[PDB]
Nucleic acid binder design. Structure first.
Lengths: 102, 109
DNA sequence: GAAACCACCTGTTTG
DNA sequence: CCAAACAGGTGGTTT
């Protein structure tokens, strides 16, 4: 469960979303590379597959593959908010949803 | 001297610019720095007149078909305040280590 | 070919 | 103050 106000770069041709490292280390641990594949679900019940990775050059956690399709379907914009949630029960499943400028 | 100067270039304004890269003339590039022979790219260690050793990455950018120095060039430019129209002279010592050497000269515009 | 993807790089900003 | 983090970039490769 963490939320980010998305930057212009987040929703542009850079095809990447930067996760703040506090939240990345707290809620999404990485094996310690090419990275892992992560499955989330939106309110429509569609399940999105993203690639979660670490860039050691910039020391930053980023979603790359699959983020742009999310941006385009949801018509994300700079200033909107993206909220990551997890299952209440043992299903262990992650959910993604988006609100707009509080 | 103990040093042999290899080549020099009067820096374009983009060499000191936000592009953070020094275009190296292909004529002068294939001559002393052959990239297939590794002189992806390679890291080169060049020492200045102040004694500071500077590490740059030397590669060939197919997009511009340019031989270029790219990583650390901005630091050199910022510390030396390299400006468009100044000159960069690359040199090599005739020693067993054959160390490479760099420093800049003055001239306007 | 175009768009996305990939692994690097850096200048500002800031606790 | 300054190392860290990150918003904004690059060239090259795969889809």
């Amino acid at each position: 469960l963490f939320e980010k106000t998305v930057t212009p770069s987040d929703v542009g041709k850079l095809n990447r979303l930067v996760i703040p490292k506090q939240h990345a280390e707290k809620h999404f641990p990485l094996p310690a590379t090419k990275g892992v594949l992560i499955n989330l679900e939106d309110r429509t019940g569609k399940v999105w597959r993203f690639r979660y990775s670490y860039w050691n050059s910039s020391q930053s956690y980023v979603l790359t593959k699959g983020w742009s399709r999310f941006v385009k379907e949801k018509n994300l914009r700079a200033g909107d908010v993206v909220c990551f949630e997890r299952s209440t029960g043992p299903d262990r499943q992650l959910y993604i949803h988006w609100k707009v400028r509080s």
